[PDB]
Each structure stands twice: as structure tokens, then as C-alpha cells.
């Protein structure tokens with residue numbers, strides 16, 4: 001089986017590849033078990049130029065007992081269709097993948113042009129909730145190759161409560177350890193073995209200061225970088241406890257948690273939660289340049305606000321001509337190997 005040309009062609013990758021730059025939109029929303037009240041265009045259609053791939057991740061899609069015991073959800077449909085109508089107006093998109101575990105759902109959309117360059121798609125889900133196993137929390141993920149560059153997108157809902165930052169670090173360490181994709185037809189890939197890893201969702205890290213009155217006022221006074229020195233995730237990374245070697249963008253939007261449903265008002269409950277930057281987008285990999293990192297106050301469907309981030313990501317895209325010239329060179333040299 002002298003099909004080693006294929007093997008050779010692989011290892012001469014450099015000679016027929018460019019690093020082309022592509023637009024990835026990534027969004028994350030905790031919908032608090034609600035159906036869409038509104039359009040999603042402010043969230044997804046806020047960039048002049050259209051994205052090339054949309055990575056949208058939801059948490060708490062369905063807070064019912066039925067969803068909690070793995071039964072089908074009407075909300076899965078409701079929110080998929082809601083996103084489809086909300087994508088950019090300057091490019092037709094198609095659905096690459098959907099993955100739900102209870103209320104955690106990741107949708108990948110792709111510009112119609114580019115879908116044919118999406119291969120080897122696999123998906124995992126890992127419940128780290130009740131008894132360390134249940135799907136009330138944990139994470140769902142999708143992986144794939146896009147051209148000759150490997151991606152793996154993780155959507156997570158990590159443990160709640162300000163005190164439990166150590167458990168969130170544990171929920172992270174569990175996902176990394178447990179999640180294992182099985183494609184193509186032998187070796188099982190884990191999350192970190194990919195070329196670009198985008199990690200988003202309700203990571204649930206809170207501000208490491210109790211006094212809620214300070215926080216509300218500091219936020220009110222525009223000074224957010226004082227607040228951000230006490231953000232648990234910022235610390236957990238700094239002290240190398242969790243999310244290394246991940247990057248995050250400068251963060252200039254007011255805390256996305258927690259609001260009074262249907263309003264831009266801070267939580268009025270008797271608990272009276274301290275506001276938090278629960279909803280985050282981190283990444284790992286080269287040729288990744290972030291352009292934006294923002295939230296969308298104008299969507300009042302949930303008690304969380306949606307967060308978005310536009311990325312420029314370099315992808316190794318095959319040049320057909322260089323590929324052919326190389327292929328022809330290789331076979332010519334092979335054929336020439338006749339004693």
C-alpha cells in the first residue's frame with residue numbers, strides 16, 4: 001500500500017499552507033431557565049463585518065426536573081432557532097453542531113462558504129454537579145478541525161457561592177481530566193491536545209470582598225480595575241491554581257451578575273447578592289488576537305447579562321496550487337526511486 005505520499009504530503013505541510021486570519025464570535029449566556037423574551041441581534045449582530053464561526057454557549061437553558069433527569073427539552077429548540085435568526089445580516093450561516101447536558105448547551109454555527117472545511121467533529125459532556133456526577137453543573141464541549149488547525153470549544157457552568165472558589169477549581173480540573181473525545185475512526189483526544197481551546201460560560205467566580213455597598217458604588221463610580229484585583233478568577237490564575245496557561249481580555253464592562261429579571265436593576269432579593277463577573281471567555285493557543293470583550297446590557301431576558309467576544313484567529317489554510325506542485329514533486333521523486 002504505497003499511499004505514503006499521503007503521509008509525506010502531511011509532513012510537507014509548511015510548503016503549501018498560509019496562516020489566514022478568520023473571525024470567531026463567541027458568546028455566553030445564563031438564561032435562568034427562561035425562553036427568549038426578545039431578539040438576539042444586539043448580542044450577535046454587533047460587529048460591522050460578519051463572523052466566520054459563531055460559538056454560542058448557554059447555561060441554565062432548562063431548570064425543570066425533566067431536563068435535570070436527561071429528558072428532552074422544548075427549550076433546546078426554542079433557543080437554537082432564536083440564535084439562527086439573530087446571526088449577522090451580511091452572511092448566510094449553517095448549523096455545525098449542538099450539545100446539551102441538562103441546561104448547558106453549546107451551538108456552533110459556520111458561514112456557509114466555510115462549512116465544507118469543518119471535519120472530525122466530536123462532542124463530550126461532563127456533569128460535576130450533585131454527587132460530582134449530575135448535570136446540574138459541569139460542562140459540555142465540541143471539537144473539530146477547521147482547515148488544518150484543530151479547535152475545541154468548552155462551555156461550562158461551574159459551582160456557585162462565593163466561598164466555593166476551591167470547588168470551582170475542582171470542577172475545572174475534573175472537566176479537563178474526564179472529558180475525552182473519540183474521533184476520527186483511534187486515539188482518544190483530550191481537551192488540551194487541541195491547537196486552539198476556547199473556554200467560556202458561567203465560571204461563577206465572585207469578587208473576593210463581602211461588602212456589597214462598596215462594590216455597587218465603585219461600579220457606579222466607573223472604577224472597575226480596583227474591583228478586578230479582588231475577582232477570584234483573576235487571583236486563581238495569578239496564583240496558578242486553575243486556568244493556566246489561559247488568557248483573558250482586559251475587562252471593561254460592569255459585572256454581569258446578578259440582575260432583577262427584565263431590568264437593569266441589581267438584585268433586590270433578601271439574599272441581596274454581591275455583583276460578580278460570573279460570565280467569562282478565556283482562550284489558549286497561538287495566532288489568537290482578541291479585538292473585543294464586552295457585555296450586552298440591553299438584553300433583559302435573564303438575571304445574567306450575555307457576554308460576547310470577537311476574535312481574529314489564524315488558521316492554516318491549504319493553497320491548492322502549492323499543494324499540487326508539492327504532491328507532483330513527491331510522486332515524481334517516488335517514481336524516480338526505481339534503482
Ligand SMILES: [Mg+2]
Nearest residue numbers: 032033060063
Ligand atoms: Mg437559576
